[PDB]
């Protein structure tokens, strides 16, 4: 398929396949396109998906000018570690 945009509510299957300022995320029902995140929002700098019995990640990268920092919160217990965005 051609360059599929996001617009918050569009099916994606590529590393991005979303608006110039959007990022593709993973959703329970199906993979959809979601907007960018900002300081304070969850961040993802380490994700491993491929082996059997894996966990879904419903998040996207931070907006331009933000740094991905680790965030200790009662949630990473699932498997992967949780991070947060910081406005540079």
**Homologous superfamily of 1-88 in CATH?**
Lipase, subunit A (2.10.80.10)
C-alpha to C-alpha distance for 8 and 28, rounded to whole angstroms: 15
Experimental method: NMR
Going from N- to C-terminal start, the domains of the chain cover: 1-88
Q: Following CA atoms 76, 80, 81, 83 in sequence, which dihedral angle do they give, to the nearest 10 degrees?
A: -100
* Pair 58, 81: CB distance under 8 Å: no
Strands (E), 10-72: 22-25, 32-35, 42-43, 66-70
């Amino acid at each position: 398929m051609p360059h599929i945009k996001g617009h918050e509510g569009d099916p994606c299957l590529r590393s991005s396949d979303c608006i110039d300022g959007f990022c593709c995320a993973r959703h329970f029902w199906t993979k959809i396109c979601k907007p960018v995140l900002h300081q304070g929002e969850v961040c993802t700098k380490q994700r491993k998906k491929g082996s059997h019995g894996l966990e879904i990640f419903q998040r996207c990268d931070c907006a331009k000018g933000l740094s991905c920092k680790v965030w200790k919160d009662a949630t990473y217990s699932s498997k992967a570690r949780l991070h947060v965005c910081q406005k540079i």
